[PDB]
Amino acid sequence: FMPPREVHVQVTHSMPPQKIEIFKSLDNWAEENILVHLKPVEKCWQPQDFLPDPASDGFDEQVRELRERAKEIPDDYFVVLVGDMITEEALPTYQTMLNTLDGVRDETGASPTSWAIWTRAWTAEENRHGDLLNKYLYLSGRVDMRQIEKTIQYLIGSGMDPRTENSPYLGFIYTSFQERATFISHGNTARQAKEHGDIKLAQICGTIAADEKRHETAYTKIVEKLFEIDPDGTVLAFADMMRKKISMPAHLMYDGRDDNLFDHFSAVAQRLGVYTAKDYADILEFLVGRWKVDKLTGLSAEGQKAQDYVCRLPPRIRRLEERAQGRAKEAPTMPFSWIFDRQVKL
Amino acid sequence: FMPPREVHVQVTHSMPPQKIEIFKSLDNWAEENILVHLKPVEKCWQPQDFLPDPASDGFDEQVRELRERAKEIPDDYFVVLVGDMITEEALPTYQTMLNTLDGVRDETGASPTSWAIWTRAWTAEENRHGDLLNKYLYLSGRVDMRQIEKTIQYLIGSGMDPRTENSPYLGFIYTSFQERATFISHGNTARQAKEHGDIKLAQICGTIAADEKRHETAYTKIVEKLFEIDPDGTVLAFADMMRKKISMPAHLMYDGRDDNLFDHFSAVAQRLGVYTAKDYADILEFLVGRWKVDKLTGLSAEGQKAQDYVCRLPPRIRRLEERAQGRAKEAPTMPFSWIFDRQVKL
Ligand SMILES: [Fe+2]
Ligand SMILES: [Fe+2]
């Protein structure tokens, strides 16, 4: 019953150590540019805002309406939603990931540094996503919670190596790409929940999307400054990540039944138009756009090629991955333990 | 609206670096002595096992029975249960904490080392506790979930510095003490749920207790080997931790309303006999017993005093903290946002 393992040689601490200082120097910069994308907790929504109120006489009719509505939502959607939700619940991993990063790590668990304050805050904000989606899914009755729980335990046990090699350059680029992927993801699960008549679920997805967009803005701003301070190392970092392809935090997903669970979940996501290969491209083009990569000049021999590769990658990735031919018609149907081994097209 | 902050100078990397090797050496030892307390995921219980089944015709009558029973459980209990639950949900922090530890850290997020495998697995096991208690509490309708959620967000944002200084010696002693504290905690919330007629909740707490006992056994076994390999550094570490007093992972608890929320939650917990100053002693006595600290001989000048301090501490802590006089009668009554500002004795 072994889950899938990371298949690539594991590289640690691949950024010149003499560069930690730049992040220690950037500390106050971060305090005034990042710790603003922090809504005070009192201002933040909480999951309870979107769920039946267990301390109200309303509770029953609310739970009943929730379920009544969930019937008009297809299984394929739920598979995607569930996958989405599982990714979210693997958060401990993700915090841990951010804390592998060399100049921006929380050395104690309660470090007073801007980098740490941000990490602990982002995590606290992120924690509400799992909770919300979880309970929603629980209440819905449309899904197999035990299999979903099992999946999550496998996932956290497995972890992820996003191949950031302990580099804040790579780490912050990764998360930049990452968070945008899930803004689109939820953006669409939201759009689609409305289309299937469930405004309250659309609201759940939409709010989660808003949160991921705010975080996107923050991590890009860190990278923007890195591009500004150290163009060379940064372009190099961006090209490195793209060469490796960004791998989603949930790729080692496993439910004890399906050895290609991630591939399969992603396929459904793609068929429904929730998150496509097309989007993956749109992300780094946006990112090449945002970081004005084309507008950079004066770099090292190695910088030249890195820039050009990263600038010219989206059109190629576009063609390469727009031949949905074998799979945008004769995709097989496949069971999913998350929905009691009911089946959906791939 | 600022939460409480850690009040002690933050010390990092206080273990001689030349000692990382001992943990790298201990790697295979850990694989055959620790990765056994790993029940395969398939064998593990999941939260759904203890909750109403949302995909059953039974769901309603189950939710109904759950709440009917929660009425016969007093508010003070719930305060304790909720605080217990919040501590649990601060898990991201705790994984992060274990990963601050120098020779036992996960360098990548999916490190193939025994130490990392254990950390990721322990975390995946621990994740179920929050989920379970959360949903239970949500269904119960006896508690204010929004205030609980808000508390959690503050908590994760705040984190904890358990003062382990990046030392696996200190880290593993901390978690050794820690996990035993919550085995007792849950042991008693369990006993007491039965006493108030809610067997299903007793089962929830009892199962969570079983998990923590398994983990206790593992972390003590790491420390046992450390005592065995390096008696000096270890006794020194144990005395250091005790001098500092072990601080619970949730001490910086805050709900936007009560500036001494931890103290207040702990007080209720003490009044109900869930976790007392008396217990805190019983833990390190058990630990001084378990690690046969008294039976050690041949140490350094500094080792002598460290051993004796640690051996003779529990009786003193016992007398010192058994004068529940000012507080084991005329404790004030106090509101708790976790229960809609209803009040309980302290
Ligand atoms: Fe998220
Ligand atoms: Fe626990």
UniProtKB/Swiss-Prot annotation, chains A, B:
Chief location: plastid
Subcellular location: Plastid, Chloroplast; Plastid
Keyword Nucleotide-binding annotated: no
Reported tissue expression: Higher levels in developing seeds than in leaf and root tissues.
List of residues binding Fe cation 2: E126, E179, E212, H215
Catalytic activity: octadecanoyl-[ACP] + 2 reduced [2Fe-2S]-[ferredoxin] + O2 + 2 H(+) = (9Z)-octadecenoyl-[ACP] + 2 oxidized [2Fe-2S]-[ferredoxin] + 2 H2O
Cofactors required: Fe(2+)
Keywords: Chloroplast, Fatty acid biosynthesis, Fatty acid metabolism, Iron, Lipid biosynthesis, Lipid metabolism, Metal-binding, Oxidoreductase, Plastid, Transit peptide
Residues reported to bind Fe cation 1: E88, E126, H129, E212
Alphabetical GO biological process terms: fatty acid biosynthetic process
One GO CC annotation: chloroplast
EC number of the protein: 1.14.19.2
Gene3D superfamilies listed in its UniProt record: Ribonucleotide Reductase, subunit A
Molecular function terms, GO-annotated: metal ion binding; stearoyl-[ACP] desaturase activity
Record function comment: Converts stearoyl-ACP to oleoyl-ACP by introduction of a cis double bond between carbons 9 and 10 of the acyl chain.
Protein name per Swiss-Prot or TrEMBL: Stearoyl-[acyl-carrier-protein] 9-desaturase, chloroplastic
Annotated source species: Ricinus communis
